[PDB]
Amino acid sequence: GFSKFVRKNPKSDKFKVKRFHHIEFWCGDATNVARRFSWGLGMRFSAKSDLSTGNMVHASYLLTSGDLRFLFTAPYSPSLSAGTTTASIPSFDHGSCRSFFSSHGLGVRAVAIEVEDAESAFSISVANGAIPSSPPIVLNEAVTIAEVKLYGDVVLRYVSYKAEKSEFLPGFERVEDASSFPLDYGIRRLDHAVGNVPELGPALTYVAGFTGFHQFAEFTAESGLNSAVLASNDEMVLLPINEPVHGTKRKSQIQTYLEHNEGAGLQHLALMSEDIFRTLREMRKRSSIGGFDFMPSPPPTYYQNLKKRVGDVLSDDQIKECEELGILVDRDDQGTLLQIFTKPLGDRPTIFIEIIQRVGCMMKDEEGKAYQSGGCGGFGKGNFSELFKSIEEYEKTL
Amino acid sequence: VGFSKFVRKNPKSDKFKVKRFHHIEFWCGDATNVARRFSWGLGMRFSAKSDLSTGNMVHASYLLTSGDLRFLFTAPYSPSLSAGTTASIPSFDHGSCRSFFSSHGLGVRAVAIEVEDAESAFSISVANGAIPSSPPIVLNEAVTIAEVKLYGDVVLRYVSYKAEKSEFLPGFERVEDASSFPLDYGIRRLDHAVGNVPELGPALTYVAGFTGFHQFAEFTESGLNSAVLASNDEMVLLPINEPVHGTKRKSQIQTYLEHNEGAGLQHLALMSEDIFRTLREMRKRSSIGGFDFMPSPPPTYYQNLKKRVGDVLSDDQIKECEELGILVDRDDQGTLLQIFTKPLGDRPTIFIEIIQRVGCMMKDEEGKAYQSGGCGGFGKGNFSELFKSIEEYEKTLE
Numbered sequence: 001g002f003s004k005f006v007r008k009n010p011k012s013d014k015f016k017v018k019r020f021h022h023i024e025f026w027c028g029d030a031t032n033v034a035r036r037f038s039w040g041l042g043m044r045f046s047a048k049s050d051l052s053t054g055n056m057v058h059a060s061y062l063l064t065s066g067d068l069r070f071l072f073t074a075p076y077s078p079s080l081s082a083g084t085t086t087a088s089i090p091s092f093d094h095g096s097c098r099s100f101f102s103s104h105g106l107g108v109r110a111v112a113i114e115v116e117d118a119e120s121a122f123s124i125s126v127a128n129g130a131i132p133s134s135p136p137i138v139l140n141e142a143v144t145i146a147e148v149k150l151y152g153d154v155v156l157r158y159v160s161y162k163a164e165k166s167e168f169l170p171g172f173e174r175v176e177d178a179s180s181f182p183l184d185y186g187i188r189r190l191d192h193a194v195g196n197v198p199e200l201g202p203a204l205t206y207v208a209g210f211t212g213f214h215q216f217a218e219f220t221a222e223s224g225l226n227s228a229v230l231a232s233n234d235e236m237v238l239l240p241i242n243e244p245v246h247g248t249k250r251k252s253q254i255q256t257y258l259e260h261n262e263g264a265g266l267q268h269l270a271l272m273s274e275d276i277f278r279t280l281r282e283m284r285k286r287s288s289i290g291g292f293d294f295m296p297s298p299p300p301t302y303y304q305n306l307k308k309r310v311g312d313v314l315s316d317d318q319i320k321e322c323e324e325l326g327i328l329v330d331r332d333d334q335g336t337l338l339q340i341f342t343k344p345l346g347d348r349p350t351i352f353i354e355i356i357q358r359v360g361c362m363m364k365d366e367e368g369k370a371y372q373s374g375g376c377g378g379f380g381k382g383n384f385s386e387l388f389k390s391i392e393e394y395e396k397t398l
Numbered sequence: 399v400g401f402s403k404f405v406r407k408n409p410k411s412d413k414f415k416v417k418r419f420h421h422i423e424f425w426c427g428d429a430t431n432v433a434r435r436f437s438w439g440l441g442m443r444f445s446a447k448s449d450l451s452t453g454n455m456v457h458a459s460y461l462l463t464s465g466d467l468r469f470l471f472t473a474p475y476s477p478s479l480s481a482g483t484t485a486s487i488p489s490f491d492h493g494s495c496r497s498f499f500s501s502h503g504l505g506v507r508a509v510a511i512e513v514e515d516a517e518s519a520f521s522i523s524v525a526n527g528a529i530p531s532s533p534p535i536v537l538n539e540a541v542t543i544a545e546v547k548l549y550g551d552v553v554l555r556y557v558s559y560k561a562e563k564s565e566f567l568p569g570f571e572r573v574e575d576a577s578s579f580p581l582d583y584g585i586r587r588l589d590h591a592v593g594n595v596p597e598l599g600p601a602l603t604y605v606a607g608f609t610g611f612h613q614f615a616e617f618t619e620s621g622l623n624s625a626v627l628a629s630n631d632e633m634v635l636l637p638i639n640e641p642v643h644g645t646k647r648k649s650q651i652q653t654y655l656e657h658n659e660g661a662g663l664q665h666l667a668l669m670s671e672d673i674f675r676t677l678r679e680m681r682k683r684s685s686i687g688g689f690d691f692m693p694s695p696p697p698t699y700y701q702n703l704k705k706r707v708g709d710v711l712s713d714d715q716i717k718e719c720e721e722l723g724i725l726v727d728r729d730d731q732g733t734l735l736q737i738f739t740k741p742l743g744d745r746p747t748i749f750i751e752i753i754q755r756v757g758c759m760m761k762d763e764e765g766k767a768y769q770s771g772g773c774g775g776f777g778k779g780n781f782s783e784l785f786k787s788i789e790e791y792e793k794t795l796e
């Protein structure tokens with residue numbers, strides 16, 4: 001006499017989508033942000049396109065950890081190139097970069113997904129409502145790149161490889177580890193990438209309309225947001241979108257975002273880790289020496305209630321580690337999610353990072369090996385309530 | 399039975415009482431990431447802040463300090479936050495700051511000096527030809543601040559205290575140690591701050607004209623002519639460089655001017671109490687978010703040291719200079735140890751010098767020990783010594 005959650009997946013992608021490729025931040029200074037993030041997250045300096053490379057238009061530095069690719073880009077003076085261009089990223093434009101950065105501060109310009117063919121992905125998107133940002137451009141007859149608007153001044157970037165490198169894109173030089181111990185805190189890939197918009201409805205119509213991504217449902221049972229999740233056919237590309245819920249006691253954090261960010265844009269990046277305990281131990285140590293800071297931890301009560309909730313999946317010693325590191329735990333139909341959120345990455349209370357680990361949903365593919373289903377454990381919607389619960393209990397125990 | 403003498407003039411012709419270098423303000427796109435990077439790279443503690451979390455709706459400003467050295471990183475918030483000020487720095491302007499950063503990239507906006515009275519300093523300066531930037535403003539009846547143009551978009555900022563704080567300026571909250579045992583690599587104060595301009599003559603005329611700073615002589619191509627302006631006591635030192643055109647190798651000064659979009663501050667020399675300690679600390683962090691250093695001199699350079707400075711430095715101290723790539727020069731009065739970083743941000747503009755001065759220890763009216771300003775000069779000899787050592791190293795391949 002149990003309960004059951006049932007999921008639909010129409011597999012309606014209008015073109016073949018593979019995986020998240022990279023995230024591009026537009027910065028004022030690529031070098032300082034890239035250096036800070038490298039130390040904070042344990043990402044390796046892996047490729048570059050700048051003056052030391054021939055590029056007189058923009059400085060672009062790629063950091064990597066597993067399959068996660070973070071690109072930091074900033075403009076040089078236009079005066080350098082006031083005389084075929086030395087830029088490696090065809091979309092890049094001085095005007096656009098400066099305007100974006102003045103308007104929004106440090107933030108994500110481009111969410112990039114690898115696809116079978118960027119030309120067709122772009123053609124199909126425009127046909128089905130997508131606003132063009134940058135057209136399909138082939139690079140050294142090796143890579144095609146196109147951009148459509150996602151929300152705000154964020155673009156969805158399509159990347160397609162002509163056939164079966166660590167140089168990322170044409171025009172980039174590989175950087176070799178200048179170290180006997182290169183950095184690695186266990187971050188492996190991008191899990192989801194969440195936008196904030198003024199109204200969820202139109203936003204969803206737009207994106208899903210041109211992509212054919214479907215709604216991934218969350219097991220449910222005050223937070224100031226209303227959200228839905230767009231998902232690719234295999235549910236490995238996940239694009240949540242939030243809107244503000246007006247009226248509530250505490251002002252919507254989404255509404256604050258929209259004010260400080262001067263509009264819609266990317267709110268957070270959930271980075272998947274092979275082991276959140278390792279990652280957080282590393283990141284927390286670096287919090288006060290140039291790394292990232294974390295949101296205030298749950299009360300003790302939260303951790304007393306974990307065995308009740310996840311004592312089947314997590315051992316006692318793992319629950320103590322969760323408490324020591326301020327880790328939230330949620331569970332859905334299919335599996336269990338460990339998560340934590342940083343404080344903002346730059347000056348404004350806009351963009352932040354989530355570290356997650358997914359437990360469960362191991363299944364066999366056609367090769368005979370295992371994979372983990374995308375969205376295993378959900379996105380931690382349970383935790384808002386589980387956190388308000390634990391605070392009120394903590395009070396009543398005081 | 400035959401020696402040489404270098405004779406220094408000092409007209410002590412300052413037009414107002416100057417005390418010391420007070421702080422340096424960098425204008426950024428993102429103050430947090432630059433401040434975090436610098437803190438880790440240079441070993442400077444987070445001391446104070448003025449931002450949203452303190453009530454500041456106009457600008458985010460973060461103070462790092464190491465001994466008497468004070469670095470301030472400032473960036474603009476959206477105008478819309480403060481359309482209805484909470485600003486701690488009265489001179490700050492959204493448009494000016496955006497415009498600076500768009501034009502010059504990461505750079506020093508303000509060279510700040512403590513004077514006895516900022517109001518009179520501004521008055522006497524403007525009367526003697528200075529172009530005013532911000533008029534004298536008194537803050538919480540406690541501190542007075544005024545600004546005049548130094549060169550390009552760099553301002554000389556005057557700071558005077560009413561009479562007889564660790565909160566730097568009114569409106570700034572002190573930051574306590576998040577972790578006991580703050581970051582400290584041995585940097586103790588600013589030694590000098592150097593500007594690049596297109597023409598030395600007009601620039602010196604202007605500055606000396608309104609300060610009454612005298613010329614400080616350098617005891618005895620490199621693509622530059624240099625002149626040093628100095629306060630009465632020679633503890634405030636302000637070198638200025640111009641390019642020497644037609645030289646074989648293009649002038650590094652001329653490069654600066656092209657990449658920076660004009661005149662601006664080229665380098666900051668930071669005094670260390672133990673340059674060996676400082677550089678071991680800084681070097682271990684180079685590849686993990688810190689700063690990179692210029693290419694070391696050839697082994698020849700270190701072999702020539704005992705002849706040049708064997709009386710001041712021991713054999714083991716010379717091997718240490720060789721381990722760390724440290725340059726050594728001498729003048730009339732004493733000995734200098736120096737090393738230069740690679741650019742601090744994207745552009746080949748501003749960099750940092752780390753110095754230790756050895757010698758000219760003297761006593762004052764109180765009888766307290768002081769070291770004279772400029773002990774050992776500024777390393778002008780090292781241009782030749784570098785060229786020599788490279789010629790010698792190349793000749794001995796044989």
Ligand SMILES: Cc1nnc(NC(=O)c2ccc(C(F)(F)F)n3c(CS(=O)(=O)C(C)C)nnc23)o1
Nearest residue numbers: 227228229240241253295341379380381383384
């Ligand atoms: C759709 C979708 N995709 N991911 C989600 N949910 C989250 O990321 C999420 C879960 C839980 C929490 C918390 F429990 F900590 F309140 N979140 C928060 C907390 S927060 O203070 O606002 C943020 C500004 C740190 N933000 N996102 C989430 O929804």
Ligand SMILES: Cc1nnc(NC(=O)c2ccc(C(F)(F)F)n3c(CS(=O)(=O)C(C)C)nnc23)o1
Nearest residue numbers: 592624626637650692738776777778780781784
């Ligand atoms: C006055 C005054 N204030 N500072 C100075 N001079 C220097 O700092 C200086 C001395 C020596 C050398 C070197 F030996 F390495 F060539 N410098 C350099 C070398 S560099 O590759 O151009 C720079 C771009 C690192 N830059 N400034 C100096 O003079």
Ligand SMILES: [Co+2]
Nearest residue numbers: 192270354379
């Ligand atoms: Co999330």
Ligand SMILES: [Co+2]
Nearest residue numbers: 592667751776
């Ligand atoms: Co110098």
